[PDB]
Amino acid sequence: NSIQIGGLFPRGADQEYSAFRVGMVQFSTSEFRLTPHIDNLEVANSFAVTNAFCSQFSRGVYAIFGFYDKKSVNTITSFCGTLHVSFITPSFPTDGTHPFVIQMRPDLKGALLSLIEYYQWDKFAYLYDSDRGLSTLQAVLDSAAEKKWQVTAINVGNINNDKKDETYRSLFQDLELKKERRVILDCERDKVNDIVDQVITIGKHVKGYHYIIANLGFTDGDLLKIQFGGAEVSGFQIVDYDDSLVSKFIERWSTLEEKEYPGAHTATIKYTSALTYDAVQVMTEAFRNLRKQRIEISRRGNAGDCLANPAVPWGQGVEIERALKQVQVEGLSGNIKFDQNGKRINYTINIMELKTNGPRKIGYWSEVDKMVLTL
Amino acid sequence: FAVTNAFCSQFSRGVYAIFGFYDKKSVNTITSFCGTLHVSFITPSFPTDGTHPFVIQMRPDLKGALLSLIEYYQWDKFAYLYDSDRGLSTLQAVLDSAAEKKWQVTAINVGNINNDKKDETYRSLFQDLELKKERRVILDCERDKV
Amino acid sequence: NDIVDQVITIGKHVKGYHYIIANLGFTDGDLLKIQFGGAEVSGFQIVD
């Protein structure tokens, strides 16, 4: 039983691919084996993504695992919907209801809004990055109307990096007109460190300031720098290292050879990589529930050109979707469940605060219970 | 997807230039293909957010004219009802300028409003625009949503 | 430089603090770090 699948990994996704490999090994069974066809392309380039998709489609794959950007996301959601091809991705959730798309990343929009009310914020600065879509930006802006907030949204994304200093100085100059002491950083693990470094330089990391890292990887970045500054730092963690499940994973992950497995010789793991590992498990349980359900879907590498007109969707794809979406197992990112669309449900996001001794979970966030503190 | 086919179809037919339209979703497809295949694309649609070669845009940038008008009326606190159809390019414009010119903008996405029951939403819309007694509104929408 | 680095880490380089580098090489070390901190820094220079 050889199930061919596609793999679209953006150049630089070392740990993500390393986690993708480990998953292939941990979830390999005799009943059937998964054959990944890896394609390293610039995820941002919409054209390239189109080729990589049609290429993996002509090779006759049953499902595709990859990533997309705020620019190429529409290409994937569209093609996968037309050709009835299933697409599993750890990337940011789609802004809507796009069929044939499985999203590993839970919606943070809810957990963020809840945290703001917890600290009882009425006036705060919102530094955002247009990389993962302004989905969360619209969230805080719309809620700012109801909850009556004075949000100071600033696009910290279009900042040219070959001279990005007179921009940060002019950034916190506007954040001083209203004496902003509460900032929300909605950026990637990289853009966050850049800001954190600047914050320490200008000395806005002392007692009185309060930062909120708006991502699922609070412990993914370096916090030792703004840890003793005095300013309170909060965030979100999706990979609970207190779970015996995750704890066991790290035991083997931290030991792996960094030569064969790039950026895999650490005690921690980026949430993007952790979702990749959990993605493999979902695809395995899905293709397994099809064998035990006596459902024939097999084909050959002659699906034809994806640009075929009229484009005819192979009916076997409808079943592959109902399989992945029906999957429900336990992974590094807590309980994994899906709805009819592909958005994760019944999940848990731990709320984190940075103390003197280090990060510490002060509670969690459920889609049904909102925020709940753990004494 | 459809836009991709229509482009490759007109490309196989061997055209010298392409005139059409794009949405906030398909815009990336056009700008990308036209840039790779060196095909010229003329469009009246909204200007691209950046510098994409092989694309001719008939629509001038309104971002500038809008910001200038706001200062003319000397607005410091206003509501900004926007539609995500033509990209949040102008939304970012007023938000970024709100930091410098020091404005209290109340941005509200009036786009995702489901039209088969869109009434309890408008009533709840001007309910928030009454907490601060907003009397100055900017409608950034299409001729229809307006 | 070791002390200056530590000073910035703990944030004792902001307005209110005053440091005096007791050596003949004030510009010999890196000052760009505690330059925008706010704390006043003085020293001595022998090479004009």
PDB file of N, CA, C and O in Angstrom, chain A residues 143-186:
ATOM      1  N   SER A 143     -13.773  44.933  17.769  1.00  0.00           N
ATOM      2  CA  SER A 143     -14.067  44.815  19.191  1.00  0.00           C
ATOM      3  C   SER A 143     -13.801  46.131  19.912  1.00  0.00           C
ATOM      4  O   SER A 143     -14.365  46.391  20.974  1.00  0.00           O
ATOM      5  N   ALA A 144     -12.939  46.957  19.326  1.00  0.00           N
ATOM      6  CA  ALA A 144     -12.624  48.262  19.896  1.00  0.00           C
ATOM      7  C   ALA A 144     -13.839  49.178  19.835  1.00  0.00           C
ATOM      8  O   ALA A 144     -13.957  50.125  20.613  1.00  0.00           O
ATOM      9  N   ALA A 145     -14.741  48.892  18.905  1.00  0.00           N
ATOM     10  CA  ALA A 145     -15.966  49.664  18.769  1.00  0.00           C
ATOM     11  C   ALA A 145     -16.960  49.280  19.858  1.00  0.00           C
ATOM     12  O   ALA A 145     -17.576  50.145  20.482  1.00  0.00           O
ATOM     13  N   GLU A 146     -17.108  47.980  20.085  1.00  0.00           N
ATOM     14  CA  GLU A 146     -18.041  47.472  21.085  1.00  0.00           C
ATOM     15  C   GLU A 146     -17.515  47.689  22.501  1.00  0.00           C
ATOM     16  O   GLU A 146     -18.162  48.343  23.317  1.00  0.00           O
ATOM     17  N   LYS A 147     -16.342  47.134  22.784  1.00  0.00           N
ATOM     18  CA  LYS A 147     -15.744  47.232  24.110  1.00  0.00           C
ATOM     19  C   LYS A 147     -15.197  48.630  24.381  1.00  0.00           C
ATOM     20  O   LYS A 147     -14.724  48.919  25.480  1.00  0.00           O
ATOM     21  N   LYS A 148     -15.266  49.492  23.372  1.00  0.00           N
ATOM     22  CA  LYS A 148     -14.801  50.870  23.499  1.00  0.00           C
ATOM     23  C   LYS A 148     -13.326  50.942  23.888  1.00  0.00           C
ATOM     24  O   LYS A 148     -12.988  51.290  25.019  1.00  0.00           O
ATOM     25  N   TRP A 149     -12.450  50.612  22.945  1.00  0.00           N
ATOM     26  CA  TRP A 149     -11.012  50.709  23.169  1.00  0.00           C
ATOM     27  C   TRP A 149     -10.394  51.791  22.294  1.00  0.00           C
ATOM     28  O   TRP A 149     -10.913  52.114  21.226  1.00  0.00           O
ATOM     29  N   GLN A 150      -9.277  52.347  22.752  1.00  0.00           N
ATOM     30  CA  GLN A 150      -8.515  53.303  21.959  1.00  0.00           C
ATOM     31  C   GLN A 150      -7.255  52.635  21.423  1.00  0.00           C
ATOM     32  O   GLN A 150      -6.166  52.806  21.970  1.00  0.00           O
ATOM     33  N   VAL A 151      -7.417  51.872  20.347  1.00  0.00           N
ATOM     34  CA  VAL A 151      -6.315  51.106  19.775  1.00  0.00           C
ATOM     35  C   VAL A 151      -5.464  51.948  18.831  1.00  0.00           C
ATOM     36  O   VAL A 151      -5.989  52.684  17.996  1.00  0.00           O
ATOM     37  N   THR A 152      -4.149  51.833  18.973  1.00  0.00           N
ATOM     38  CA  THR A 152      -3.219  52.518  18.085  1.00  0.00           C
ATOM     39  C   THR A 152      -2.520  51.507  17.183  1.00  0.00           C
ATOM     40  O   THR A 152      -1.408  51.066  17.474  1.00  0.00           O
ATOM     41  N   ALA A 153      -3.184  51.140  16.092  1.00  0.00           N
ATOM     42  CA  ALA A 153      -2.652  50.146  15.167  1.00  0.00           C
ATOM     43  C   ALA A 153      -1.532  50.720  14.306  1.00  0.00           C
ATOM     44  O   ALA A 153      -1.679  51.788  13.710  1.00  0.00           O
ATOM     45  N   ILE A 154      -0.415  50.002  14.242  1.00  0.00           N
ATOM     46  CA  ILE A 154       0.729  50.436  13.450  1.00  0.00           C
ATOM     47  C   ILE A 154       1.355  49.268  12.697  1.00  0.00           C
ATOM     48  O   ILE A 154       1.819  48.304  13.304  1.00  0.00           O
ATOM     49  N   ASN A 155       1.369  49.364  11.371  1.00  0.00           N
ATOM     50  CA  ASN A 155       1.960  48.325  10.536  1.00  0.00           C
ATOM     51  C   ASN A 155       3.480  48.318  10.644  1.00  0.00           C
ATOM     52  O   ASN A 155       4.164  49.105   9.990  1.00  0.00           O
ATOM     53  N   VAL A 156       4.000  47.423  11.477  1.00  0.00           N
ATOM     54  CA  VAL A 156       5.439  47.314  11.696  1.00  0.00           C
ATOM     55  C   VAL A 156       6.066  46.349  10.691  1.00  0.00           C
ATOM     56  O   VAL A 156       7.185  45.872  10.882  1.00  0.00           O
ATOM     57  N   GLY A 157       5.340  46.075   9.613  1.00  0.00           N
ATOM     58  CA  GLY A 157       5.784  45.117   8.618  1.00  0.00           C
ATOM     59  C   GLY A 157       6.588  45.711   7.475  1.00  0.00           C
ATOM     60  O   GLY A 157       7.675  45.227   7.156  1.00  0.00           O
ATOM     61  N   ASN A 158       6.058  46.762   6.859  1.00  0.00           N
ATOM     62  CA  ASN A 158       6.693  47.369   5.690  1.00  0.00           C
ATOM     63  C   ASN A 158       7.977  48.124   6.005  1.00  0.00           C
ATOM     64  O   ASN A 158       8.448  48.926   5.197  1.00  0.00           O
ATOM     65  N   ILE A 159       8.541  47.865   7.178  1.00  0.00           N
ATOM     66  CA  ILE A 159       9.774  48.522   7.589  1.00  0.00           C
ATOM     67  C   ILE A 159      10.984  47.924   6.871  1.00  0.00           C
ATOM     68  O   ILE A 159      11.359  46.780   7.126  1.00  0.00           O
ATOM     69  N   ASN A 160      11.596  48.704   5.981  1.00  0.00           N
ATOM     70  CA  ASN A 160      12.796  48.260   5.270  1.00  0.00           C
ATOM     71  C   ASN A 160      13.951  47.971   6.229  1.00  0.00           C
ATOM     72  O   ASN A 160      14.368  48.841   6.988  1.00  0.00           O
ATOM     73  N   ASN A 161      14.476  46.751   6.178  1.00  0.00           N
ATOM     74  CA  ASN A 161      15.438  46.279   7.174  1.00  0.00           C
ATOM     75  C   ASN A 161      16.895  46.777   7.048  1.00  0.00           C
ATOM     76  O   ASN A 161      17.694  46.566   7.965  1.00  0.00           O
ATOM     77  N   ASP A 162      17.232  47.405   5.914  1.00  0.00           N
ATOM     78  CA  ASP A 162      18.589  47.916   5.628  1.00  0.00           C
ATOM     79  C   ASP A 162      18.772  49.373   6.077  1.00  0.00           C
ATOM     80  O   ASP A 162      19.497  50.142   5.448  1.00  0.00           O
ATOM     81  N   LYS A 163      18.117  49.742   7.175  1.00  0.00           N
ATOM     82  CA  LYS A 163      18.100  51.117   7.682  1.00  0.00           C
ATOM     83  C   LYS A 163      16.943  51.245   8.668  1.00  0.00           C
ATOM     84  O   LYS A 163      16.425  52.327   8.889  1.00  0.00           O
ATOM     85  N   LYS A 164      16.517  50.124   9.242  1.00  0.00           N
ATOM     86  CA  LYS A 164      15.360  50.128  10.142  1.00  0.00           C
ATOM     87  C   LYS A 164      15.727  50.514  11.575  1.00  0.00           C
ATOM     88  O   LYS A 164      15.785  49.662  12.461  1.00  0.00           O
ATOM     89  N   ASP A 165      15.954  51.800  11.805  1.00  0.00           N
ATOM     90  CA  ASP A 165      16.342  52.285  13.123  1.00  0.00           C
ATOM     91  C   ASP A 165      15.734  53.662  13.362  1.00  0.00           C
ATOM     92  O   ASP A 165      15.172  53.929  14.428  1.00  0.00           O
ATOM     93  N   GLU A 166      15.852  54.531  12.361  1.00  0.00           N
ATOM     94  CA  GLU A 166      15.212  55.838  12.401  1.00  0.00           C
ATOM     95  C   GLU A 166      13.703  55.669  12.276  1.00  0.00           C
ATOM     96  O   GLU A 166      12.943  56.629  12.415  1.00  0.00           O
ATOM     97  N   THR A 167      13.282  54.439  11.997  1.00  0.00           N
ATOM     98  CA  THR A 167      11.867  54.113  11.889  1.00  0.00           C
ATOM     99  C   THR A 167      11.307  53.689  13.242  1.00  0.00           C
ATOM    100  O   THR A 167      10.194  54.061  13.610  1.00  0.00           O
ATOM    101  N   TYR A 168      12.085  52.905  13.981  1.00  0.00           N
ATOM    102  CA  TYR A 168      11.691  52.477  15.319  1.00  0.00           C
ATOM    103  C   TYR A 168      11.718  53.640  16.306  1.00  0.00           C
ATOM    104  O   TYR A 168      10.865  53.735  17.189  1.00  0.00           O
ATOM    105  N   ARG A 169      12.696  54.524  16.144  1.00  0.00           N
ATOM    106  CA  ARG A 169      12.791  55.713  16.978  1.00  0.00           C
ATOM    107  C   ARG A 169      11.593  56.622  16.730  1.00  0.00           C
ATOM    108  O   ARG A 169      11.090  57.272  17.649  1.00  0.00           O
ATOM    109  N   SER A 170      11.143  56.663  15.481  1.00  0.00           N
ATOM    110  CA  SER A 170       9.978  57.455  15.107  1.00  0.00           C
ATOM    111  C   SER A 170       8.695  56.680  15.391  1.00  0.00           C
ATOM    112  O   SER A 170       7.597  57.234  15.330  1.00  0.00           O
ATOM    113  N   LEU A 171       8.845  55.397  15.702  1.00  0.00           N
ATOM    114  CA  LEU A 171       7.705  54.549  16.028  1.00  0.00           C
ATOM    115  C   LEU A 171       7.285  54.735  17.480  1.00  0.00           C
ATOM    116  O   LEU A 171       6.106  54.932  17.775  1.00  0.00           O
ATOM    117  N   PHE A 172       8.258  54.671  18.382  1.00  0.00           N
ATOM    118  CA  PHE A 172       7.995  54.855  19.805  1.00  0.00           C
ATOM    119  C   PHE A 172       7.889  56.336  20.158  1.00  0.00           C
ATOM    120  O   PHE A 172       7.648  56.696  21.311  1.00  0.00           O
ATOM    121  N   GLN A 173       8.074  57.188  19.156  1.00  0.00           N
ATOM    122  CA  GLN A 173       7.880  58.622  19.323  1.00  0.00           C
ATOM    123  C   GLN A 173       6.391  58.932  19.265  1.00  0.00           C
ATOM    124  O   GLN A 173       5.903  59.830  19.952  1.00  0.00           O
ATOM    125  N   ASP A 174       5.674  58.176  18.439  1.00  0.00           N
ATOM    126  CA  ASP A 174       4.225  58.303  18.341  1.00  0.00           C
ATOM    127  C   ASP A 174       3.558  57.552  19.488  1.00  0.00           C
ATOM    128  O   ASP A 174       2.455  57.898  19.913  1.00  0.00           O
ATOM    129  N   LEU A 175       4.240  56.524  19.983  1.00  0.00           N
ATOM    130  CA  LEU A 175       3.743  55.744  21.109  1.00  0.00           C
ATOM    131  C   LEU A 175       4.076  56.432  22.426  1.00  0.00           C
ATOM    132  O   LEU A 175       3.957  55.838  23.497  1.00  0.00           O
ATOM    133  N   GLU A 176       4.498  57.689  22.337  1.00  0.00           N
ATOM    134  CA  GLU A 176       4.823  58.471  23.521  1.00  0.00           C
ATOM    135  C   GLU A 176       3.927  59.703  23.613  1.00  0.00           C
ATOM    136  O   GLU A 176       3.808  60.318  24.674  1.00  0.00           O
ATOM    137  N   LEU A 177       3.298  60.057  22.497  1.00  0.00           N
ATOM    138  CA  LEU A 177       2.348  61.163  22.474  1.00  0.00           C
ATOM    139  C   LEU A 177       1.188  60.862  23.414  1.00  0.00           C
ATOM    140  O   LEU A 177       0.675  61.755  24.089  1.00  0.00           O
ATOM    141  N   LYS A 178       0.780  59.598  23.446  1.00  0.00           N
ATOM    142  CA  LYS A 178      -0.284  59.151  24.336  1.00  0.00           C
ATOM    143  C   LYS A 178       0.293  58.324  25.479  1.00  0.00           C
ATOM    144  O   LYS A 178      -0.442  57.676  26.225  1.00  0.00           O
ATOM    145  N   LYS A 179       1.616  58.353  25.607  1.00  0.00           N
ATOM    146  CA  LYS A 179       2.310  57.625  26.665  1.00  0.00           C
ATOM    147  C   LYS A 179       1.879  56.163  26.720  1.00  0.00           C
ATOM    148  O   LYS A 179       1.562  55.640  27.791  1.00  0.00           O
ATOM    149  N   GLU A 180       1.871  55.507  25.563  1.00  0.00           N
ATOM    150  CA  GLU A 180       1.488  54.102  25.480  1.00  0.00           C
ATOM    151  C   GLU A 180       2.446  53.222  26.274  1.00  0.00           C
ATOM    152  O   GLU A 180       3.653  53.226  26.033  1.00  0.00           O
ATOM    153  N   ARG A 181       1.903  52.469  27.223  1.00  0.00           N
ATOM    154  CA  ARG A 181       2.704  51.579  28.052  1.00  0.00           C
ATOM    155  C   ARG A 181       2.294  50.125  27.847  1.00  0.00           C
ATOM    156  O   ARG A 181       2.917  49.211  28.389  1.00  0.00           O
ATOM    157  N   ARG A 182       1.244  49.915  27.063  1.00  0.00           N
ATOM    158  CA  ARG A 182       0.737  48.572  26.807  1.00  0.00           C
ATOM    159  C   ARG A 182       0.727  48.261  25.314  1.00  0.00           C
ATOM    160  O   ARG A 182      -0.075  48.809  24.560  1.00  0.00           O
ATOM    161  N   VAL A 183       1.628  47.376  24.897  1.00  0.00           N
ATOM    162  CA  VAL A 183       1.797  47.059  23.484  1.00  0.00           C
ATOM    163  C   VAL A 183       1.478  45.598  23.181  1.00  0.00           C
ATOM    164  O   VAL A 183       1.808  44.705  23.961  1.00  0.00           O
ATOM    165  N   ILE A 184       0.831  45.363  22.043  1.00  0.00           N
ATOM    166  CA  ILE A 184       0.546  44.010  21.582  1.00  0.00           C
ATOM    167  C   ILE A 184       1.333  43.718  20.311  1.00  0.00           C
ATOM    168  O   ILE A 184       1.115  44.351  19.279  1.00  0.00           O
ATOM    169  N   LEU A 185       2.251  42.760  20.391  1.00  0.00           N
ATOM    170  CA  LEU A 185       3.080  42.406  19.247  1.00  0.00           C
ATOM    171  C   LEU A 185       2.494  41.236  18.463  1.00  0.00           C
ATOM    172  O   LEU A 185       2.614  40.079  18.868  1.00  0.00           O
ATOM    173  N   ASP A 186       1.856  41.547  17.340  1.00  0.00           N
ATOM    174  CA  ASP A 186       1.302  40.523  16.464  1.00  0.00           C
ATOM    175  C   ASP A 186       2.239  40.286  15.288  1.00  0.00           C
ATOM    176  O   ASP A 186       2.009  40.788  14.190  1.00  0.00           O
TER     177      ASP A 186
END
